[PDB]
Specification:
TIM Barrel, binds sodium ion, binds zinc ion, hydrolase, four-stranded parallel beta sheet, 9 helices, alpha/beta
């Protein structure tokens, strides 16, 4: 009653240095043997950029190691997708990342939140043309370094958008601002470059919807971007994170019924990971439910990723297919 198919069986890992890149390379054969066929590689700004040399840092991932990662993924038939957050997560704790350190004027809230106090993290201004000039150059560079035609543009961790402090965005509708950013990125990545574009679904969900929302452990933040879900192209692939153990994960049919392809993503805990996989397999006959993406909760080095117990104990459910 439906053609047999092979799921996306993905692992998310971050690389920010040559060392963490080499650690990952050592684990790739064992990941493939487990059944992983896809790697989402979070780079952010942690690459030795040539396109905008002001963002270069001598301690982050090199070109040489980056190309090695890509060559090992090609050899093993692992589909490699680099991830750069193109609007959110522009800082962490009291550290501001390379783009806003070099260009403070591209911040959505210039002059506010010293040391990022009272906010989770900073956002770029979604109306500033220079933001897109820089970002398109980084997307072009990182896809060429990894020799790929896929890109994950992030877009979670956007907590500041349409802020009173912003002279371009103040007063403006938050859903239109966010859809505008997505559509600018789509026009470059998909229309011009021909890539497949992925993003996180966080900002597309009504956090106050009892079925699809109430995800985070805190009712904090604003919930004004979600109507953008109806304003963006439906060939963008939505990675949909969960961390709880539930019998139903309502954001999955939410996105499927809005016409998107969805990649449910888990985190910590065998029981929670298994619960999300089992729920998603209720949709196994829907080709838009692409598979699963694992994340290794407390792993900052990439050592031993192929032995991550929630993956080891559940991946055979996905190797079985639909
Ligand atoms: Na990184
Ligand atoms: Na390459
Ligand atoms: Zn963040
Ligand atoms: Zn702005």
């Amino acid at each position: 009653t439906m053609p047999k198919r092979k799921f996306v069986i993905a692992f998310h890992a971050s690389v920010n240095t040559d060392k963490t890149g080499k650690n990952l390379i050592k684990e790739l054969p064992d990941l493939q043997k487990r059944g992983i066929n896809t790697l989402f590689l979070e780079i952010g700004y942690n690459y030795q950029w040539k396109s905008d040399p002001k963002l270069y840092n001598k301690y982050v991932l090199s070109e040489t190691v980056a190309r090695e990662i890509a060559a090992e993924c090609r050899r093993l038939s692992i589909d490699l997708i680099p991830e750069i957050n193109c609007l959110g997560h522009q800082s962490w704790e009291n550290e501001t990342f390379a783009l806003l350190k070099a260009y403070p004027e591209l911040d959505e809230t210039p002059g506010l939140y010293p040391s990022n106090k009272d906010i989770y993290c900073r956002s770029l201004c979604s109306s500033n043309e220079k933001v897109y000039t820089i970002l398109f150059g980084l997307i072009d560079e990182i896809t060429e370094v990894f020799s790929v035609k896929k890109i994950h543009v992030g877009l979670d961790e956007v907590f500041l958008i349409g802020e009173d402090a912003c002279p371009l965005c103040r007063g403006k509708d938050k859903a239109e601002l966010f859809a505008g950013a997505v559509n600018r990125l789509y026009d470059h990545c998909v229309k011009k470059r021909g890539f497949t574009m992925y993003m996180w679904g966080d900002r597309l969900i009504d956090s106050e919807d009892e079925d699809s929302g109430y995800k985070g452990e805190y009712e904090s933040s604003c919930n004004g971007t979600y109507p953008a879900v109806d304003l963006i192209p439906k060939d963008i692939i939505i990675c949909d994170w969960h961390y709880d153990e539930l019998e139903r994960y309502g954001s999955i049919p939410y996105f499927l019924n809005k016409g998107f392809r969805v990649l449910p993503t888990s985190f910590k805990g065998i029981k929670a990971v298994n619960a999300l996989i089992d729920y998603s397999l209720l949709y196994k006959d829907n080709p838009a439910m692409l598979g699963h993406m694992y994340t290794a909760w407390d792993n900052f080095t990439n050592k031993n990723l192929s032995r991550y117990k929630p993956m080891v104990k559940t991946i055979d459910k996905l190797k079985a297919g639909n």
